[PDB]
Ligand binder design. Structure first.
Ligand SMILES: [Cu+2]
Ligand SMILES: [Cu+2]
Lengths: 114, 118
């Protein structure tokens, strides 16, 4: 059994053609997980995970702030205390239009990697 | 399977009472349940003050994230308290339980592979 403060996990900065202003913590990864992995994303002000899709689902819980969710067309903002279920193959992404960091938990089946 | 995305305030789910031989003072919200989940389920547990999930084990893992309060985690040997912002991984078959020794509600997210139910 592993009991740990999520903040103490070292975040990974992401800056690519499709993801900018985002840090990722792998809390429960491939080393431990028999079936699915647990990540915590921090989206800086102005940060973006552009529209994408994959053959696996997301299960998300918004921990802090106002998260903008990009849909195949349009977008929807949600707050801390929302959960999000993204079906396999659905186009989605994320943006932070606020002036403070947004945090969300994100779980995927292990075929999606960590 | 189906397409789309669900976006919903977790508290829009009513907290249902859990009452078994080994659980008292606990309510549960099924967020992403069997009816929808391809692989694993997402629940939000509320432990009332003095509530207890006694030591148990099962042939699936838990992945937990503490959302609110101070959660006492029962281990095969002793116990350890964690707080909001801690995660917990429980291996399959590991002895574990939970207790709320405080005077306020403790809340945690708990995900299991869907073969273990919701
Ligand atoms: Cu995605
Ligand atoms: Cu259990």
């Amino acid at each position: 059994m592993i009991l740990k403060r999520a903040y103490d996990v070292t975040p990974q900065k992401i800056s690519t053609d499709k993801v900018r202003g985002v840090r990722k913590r792998v809390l429960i990864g491939l080393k431990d997980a028999p079936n699915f992995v647990m990540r915590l994303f921090t989206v800086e002000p102005g940060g973006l995970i552009d529209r994408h899709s994959h053959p696996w689902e997301h299960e998300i819980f918004v921990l802090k702030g106002k998260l903008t969710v990009l849909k195949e067309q349009g977008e929807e903002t949600v707050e801390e205390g929302f959960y999000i279920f993204v079906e396999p193959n659905e186009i989605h992404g994320f943006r932070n239009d606020t002036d403070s960091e947004v945090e969300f938990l994100c779980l995927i089946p292990k075929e999606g990697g960590e």
